[PDB]
Amino acid sequence: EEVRQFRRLFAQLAGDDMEVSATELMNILNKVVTRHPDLKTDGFGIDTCRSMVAVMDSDTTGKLGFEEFKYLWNNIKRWQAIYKQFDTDRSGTICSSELPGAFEAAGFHLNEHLYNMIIRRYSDESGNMDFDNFISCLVRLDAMFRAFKSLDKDGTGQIQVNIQEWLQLTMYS
Amino acid sequence: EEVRQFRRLFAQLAGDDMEVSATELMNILNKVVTRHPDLKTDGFGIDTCRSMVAVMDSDTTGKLGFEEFKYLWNNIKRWQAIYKQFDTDRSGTICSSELPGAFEAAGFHLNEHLYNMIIRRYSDESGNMDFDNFISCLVRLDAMFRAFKSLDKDGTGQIQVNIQEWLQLTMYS
Numbered sequence: 001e002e003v004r005q006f007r008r009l010f011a012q013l014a015g016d017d018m019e020v021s022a023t024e025l026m027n028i029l030n031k032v033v034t035r036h037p038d039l040k041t042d043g044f045g046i047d048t049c050r051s052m053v054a055v056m057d058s059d060t061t062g063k064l065g066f067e068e069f070k071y072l073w074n075n076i077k078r079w080q081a082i083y084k085q086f087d088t089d090r091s092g093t094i095c096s097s098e099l100p101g102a103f104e105a106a107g108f109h110l111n112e113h114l115y116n117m118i119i120r121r122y123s124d125e126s127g128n129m130d131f132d133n134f135i136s137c138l139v140r141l142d143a144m145f146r147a148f149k150s151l152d153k154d155g156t157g158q159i160q161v162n163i164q165e166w167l168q169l170t171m172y173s
Numbered sequence: 174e175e176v177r178q179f180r181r182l183f184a185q186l187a188g189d190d191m192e193v194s195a196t197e198l199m200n201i202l203n204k205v206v207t208r209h210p211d212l213k214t215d216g217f218g219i220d221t222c223r224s225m226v227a228v229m230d231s232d233t234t235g236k237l238g239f240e241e242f243k244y245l246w247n248n249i250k251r252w253q254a255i256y257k258q259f260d261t262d263r264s265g266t267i268c269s270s271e272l273p274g275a276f277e278a279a280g281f282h283l284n285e286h287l288y289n290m291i292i293r294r295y296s297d298e299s300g301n302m303d304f305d306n307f308i309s310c311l312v313r314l315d316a317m318f319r320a321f322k323s324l325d326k327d328g329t330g331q332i333q334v335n336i337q338e339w340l341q342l343t344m345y346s
């Protein structure tokens with residue numbers, strides 16, 4: 001009864017409006033990381049969770065319905081496993097050297113330039129990335145892959161994006 | 174002596190590497206808003222300030238040099254004055270009703286669907302937006318418009334990108 005127990009997880013987490021808000025997501029995540037001492041974090045901030053919710057909120061209800069949440073949560077579960085696997089010095093954080101292997105293992109094969117860009121945006125002055133920043137980066141990276149894929153109808157490797165779609169994809173995220 | 178003084182602030186804030194990090198930006202932003210009770214805020218969070226740095230970091234030092242900082246700073250001061258001006262309610266926050274005047278006065282004219290996304294992503298359940306969310310929203314919007322315009326010089330309203338570029342545009346940010 002796994003999908004049962006997951007259905008229970010969602011229902012109790014979503015509460016009275018049956019959708020998962022930025023705050024409810026923030027709270028469950030902080031609650032869960034608390035039990036994983038191998039994962040260092042300063043915590044999931046509200047801003048970060050609003051951004052994770054918008055980027056998963058396919059129907060734009062402001063909040064995460066069952067499928068949108070299930071997709072997010074199944075990814076976080078695989079990604080968490082990967083972070084542990086690739087923290088091979090047990091700093092509880094992913095440094096620049098560990099990051100490629102980790103992201104590849106989640107199925108994003110980026111080049112050097114991009115790996116650097118990501119380190120610049122999401123890692124600290126030491127080149128170290130803690131767990132909330134890794135999850136947040138990955139959720140967005142995956143959404144941006146998926147959004148490109150949707151727009152490349154013809155499979156040319158190029159998308160045309162109008163300003164309305166651009167603003168929608170960049171501001172609601 | 175507006176120039177002298179602004180160069181002196183910059184120097185003292187930027188410290189020994191002569192650039193403003195996300196953390197230095199965070200601290201001066203929270204220091205400043207304290208002396209402005211009318212700008213209601215739960216504080217500028219480090220996440221929000223890394224995003225602010227990233228979107229303004231044109232030379233990709235990972236940090237804001239003098240010009241990059243001055244440019245961000247001057248927008249913040251302008252938008253800050255717009256925030257009070259359009260908080261005609263004087264609640265210290267911007268509600269869904271005051272929002273479009275504020276954005277119109279920052280020169281952004283957006284359709285209703287975009288407004289709804291932005292209210293959803295930046296405002297609380299009362300439809301109120303506080304100062305750090307506001308500034309964070311506009312620094313992002315302004316950047317996203319400058320990104321797109323930069324790539325669509327002759328106002329076709331469309332850009333064409335491959336995945337590398339799209340990831341640069343949407344993840345560095």
Ligand SMILES: O=C(O)/C(S)=C\c1ccc(Cl)cc1
Binds near residue numbers: 033077080
């Ligand atoms: O947290 C859980 O209850 C489950 S079943 C998997 C899991 C482990 C770690 C994180 Cl951060 C999220 C989910």
Ligand SMILES: O=C(O)/C(S)=C\c1ccc(Cl)cc1
Binds near residue numbers: 202205206209249250
């Ligand atoms: O910070 C300043 O020196 C001035 S003049 C205006 C101002 C007020 C609030 C913020 Cl957050 C930034 C600038």
Ligand SMILES: [Ca+2]
Binds near residue numbers: 014016020024
């Ligand atoms: Ca709920």
Ligand SMILES: [Ca+2]
Binds near residue numbers: 058059060063064065
């Ligand atoms: Ca939704």
Ligand SMILES: [Ca+2]
Binds near residue numbers: 095
């Ligand atoms: Ca490590």
Ligand SMILES: [Ca+2]
Binds near residue numbers: 041042043130131133
């Ligand atoms: Ca963090």
Ligand SMILES: [Ca+2]
Binds near residue numbers: 187188193
């Ligand atoms: Ca500095």
Ligand SMILES: [Ca+2]
Binds near residue numbers: 230231234236237
């Ligand atoms: Ca810079």
Ligand SMILES: [Ca+2]
Binds near residue numbers: 264265266267271
């Ligand atoms: Ca108001």
Ligand SMILES: [Ca+2]
Binds near residue numbers: 215216304306
């Ligand atoms: Ca806020």
